[PDB]
Structure formats: structure tokens, C-alpha cells
Amino acid sequence: LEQLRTVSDVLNERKQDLADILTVAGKFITSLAEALASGPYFKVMLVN
Amino acid sequence: LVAAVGFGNTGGDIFERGGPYLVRGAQDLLPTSALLDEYSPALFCTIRNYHDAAPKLAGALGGNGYSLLTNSLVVGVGNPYVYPDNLPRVNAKGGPEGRPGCWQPITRDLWPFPYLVMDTGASIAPYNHFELGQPMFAEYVWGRQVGENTINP
Amino acid sequence: ETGLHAYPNLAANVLNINSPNQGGIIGLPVFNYLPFGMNLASTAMTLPKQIAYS
Amino acid sequence: IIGRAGGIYGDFFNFYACDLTLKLNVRTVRITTQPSGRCTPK
Amino acid sequence: GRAAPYLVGALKLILTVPFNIDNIPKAIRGDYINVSLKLDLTLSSVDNAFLSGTGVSGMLRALEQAWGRDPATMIPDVRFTPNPHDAPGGPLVERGE
């Protein structure tokens, strides 16, 4: 219970960071997986 | 008796608020628990392999400090997915050799990873030969292309 | 919700990206674009010995 | 950063090759490198 | 519990499988991923990329191997290096039980 306390404390101090992770990672996974959908490859825009 | 009154009231309130929640959670945890148990063998090896590969995939993209290191060789690509047959599926199950697990670590002594075909509707299994692309030439004005789309090249 | 919905398909597609014989990941380069496109041939990504069934 | 890296301009990833070189036989011939700009050590 | 010591290090990669979190802010400077292109045209790369799976898989592989190049620095010859599927002793799989 004590080690769970310290783990949960470091998690609770960074609960806003967990929420930010979920928020900013749930809004681009479809967009990122879109590129590698056409075929057995992934498109790239080689600017140079 | 007074302490029993107070404790009984408080505990009854807490239990009445959080009892059905726990009951339905423990009822709904059966499929997730069975799934986690079924695919337990591929946990330690997966985490071990990711830990092993983390320094390498970190030094690859962090070695220069301003770019990424890649080895660029030209190759041919397969036929794009057809509409009805290659639709996404989420019916993947099992692991290598029919049961969940991991391959032994891939050094340079055994470099080619065995391709694992899963029930997803997309695969590159029959690419065992050099063949000309089925949509070899395509026109994007009237949508007419040379060759017939297929799933069996 | 969106992660749980969209990650398995990303995982399956990136697994299908990898070419066992050539190693690594294959990335083809890309008015909007040219009216005509070509795909000369497809190389042997795998071999009959390298195929293991899930 | 990776969310705004690729997949926002279309159906493709965004790559920016600052330094491209040719390897052939076993000498490696350097073609283009960018000293300063978006690709500097940081 | 078996993988508990390695989990903290795996979290650097086990979420973003191809990207390592440590050096993202300097590799990707906004809207464009940086990359360095090593366009290799060595006969090993040509043999593996194009002539694999056919009857001329060894036409120019031995041509490079007979030269000063060494097998260690060459990409493995897919027709001879064993794989975890058909390697001697049966399939080479590790299962946690």
C-alpha cells in the first residue's frame, strides 16, 4: 500500500499530463494511419 | 451503540452508492480478464524486446541530433488494396505457430522475421515472385487503367 | 475511444508495410498531381519458407 | 509534434531530407548537406 | 512482474513503436520530419531488392561476395540465413508460462 501510495502520487501529480496525452493522441491517430492505408507501403512527401 | 449507529449509516451510504458499480464492473471484467490471460505469454518477451530495441531506435534518430539516419534503396511495390476483399477486419487472434508468444530475438544470425498472417483481410503472403503490377498504367481523367485488380498476384 | 477504435488497423497496416526480404519499411514518394501514374512491377516481398500463420 | 509532423497535408507523411548521399561500389559520395537552418544540432 | 524491470525503459517505445520519445523535439522541427538519405546502390541492395525470389537470386550476389566486400557488412542473403520459422530444431518461439 505504501509503494502504491508513492506510485499513485507520482501519477496524480501528472494526471493532467495523462489527460493531455489521451487528448492529443486521440485526435491524430486516424490522420496518421490514413497515409499508410492505400497499399503495402506508406506515402512520403520528400520536399528535397 | 452510538458508534454502531454512526458507522452503520456511513458504511450503508457508501455501499449503497458503490455496490452496483462494483458488481457490474466485476461482471464486465470477465472478457477482458480472459483476453489478458489468453495472451499473457507474449507479455514479458514483448516488453523485453522493446526495452532492448529502445536504445537502438533512440540512437538511430538521435545520433546526428539534427536529422534521422536511414538506408534508402529502391524497390518495387505491390498492388493496392481492392475495395470489397481487402476491407479492414479486427478479427486478429493468436500468435506465432498458432498460439500467442514472441519469436526468438532477431540478431543478424537469424535476420528474416517469419511473416505472421492474421485475420485482417490484408496480407503480403503471395508476393513470392517478380511480376508486373496489375494496375501497370492508370489514367486519372476517366478512371480507366490497364490490367485487372486482383487479390491473387 | 478514438485510440481504441483506430489503433488495431494502424497496427495491422504497419505490419503489412514491412517487407521481410528487403528489410525495413517501404515508402513510396508522391494542379494537384499528374494525370498519369505507373507501377512497373512488384518484387518478391516474402518467400514460401518465411510464411507463418497466426 | 508527431501529430503535426505528417498526415495533415494529405494522405502522406512529411519528410525533409537535409543531406542526401549516394553509396555505391564502396565509397559514399555526398551530394547535398544543409549546414544551417531547420537541421542544426540542438 | 517478470517484465517489471524493463517496463520503465519500454515505455519510451512501446506506445510509439517507431518513434523514440527522447529525441522527437529535435528530429521533427514542426511540420516536416527531418531525415538523411543514404541512397545505396551496392550489388547486395540490388540483389535483395529486385532479384529476390527468382532463379537469378545468386547471379550477382556471389559477384559482390567474390569481391572485397565481406558477408558481415552485407545485408543477409535471404536464401541461406535461417529464420525462426524453419530453423533447425523446429520453430524458434519463446512463450511465457
Added chain:
Amino acid sequence: GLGINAPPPCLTGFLPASQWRSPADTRTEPLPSGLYCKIPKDAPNAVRGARN
């Protein structure tokens, strides 16, 4: 991969072509939401996209 424009990229449902940013600017901006290949849900292009 060899072969140019064999699958064409779908710019339908992504950032406008005039909203593309110059590579000379390293400033990171907030990422917009709800962008994916918005093609009519047929044809060989992007069969395994989000819409499926």
C-alpha cells in the same frame, strides 16, 4: 517504392493547399482535428483508411 503516382494521395478532408507552412519556420502550432481521407468510400484508393 518504384512507380510514381500509382496510388494518388487523397487531399480531400485534409488541410487546404494554401494552409501549408514553409519549412523555414520551426514554430509548432496546434494540430487541427477531424482530418482524414474523405473519398466516396469505394475505388482502390485508400481502401483501408479511417472511413472503413
